[PDB]
Symmetry: C2
Subunit: 60 residues, 2 copies
RNA sequence: AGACAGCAUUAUGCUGUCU
RNA sequence: AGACAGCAUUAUGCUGUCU
């Protein structure tokens, strides 16, 4: 019968492939400057907050 | 820690249907183009040879 | 001619969490 | 701007096992 560590290494090989795909797709999009509405919302919240935090940093 | 075994079994059942779905799509795609791998050619020749030897 | 599987290369869309 | 994840759609090449 198949030993459990082998099951573990196969899932690990598999997880690695998924991360590689996602990385490839992420970088493709970045290069085309494509974002999803949620990616977009999310960066916009971040940039807004960076501005605000440096407005507390001028209060020094 | 706190994630049931039956969920794991299900998740893997899902992943396995999607793997089978991909073979099917890839397999059929190759059929349309009439494309065989070198090994698929050997196999089919050896089969057709065994079949013609019968008659 | 078919059934099943392994390996490898690779595209696209969206959503959610943390910072 | 990053980190991590989930769903969905989808292309290619090869190898092996059984009949």
């Amino acid at each position: 019968e198949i030993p459990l560590h082998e099951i573990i290494r196969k899932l690990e090989r598999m997880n690695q492939k998924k991360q590689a795909q996602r990385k490839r797709h992420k970088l493709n999009r970045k290069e085309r400057g494509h974002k999803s509405p949620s990616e977009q919302r999310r960066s916009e919240l971040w940039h807004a907050r960076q501005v605000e935090l440096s407005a507390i940093n001028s209060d020094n």
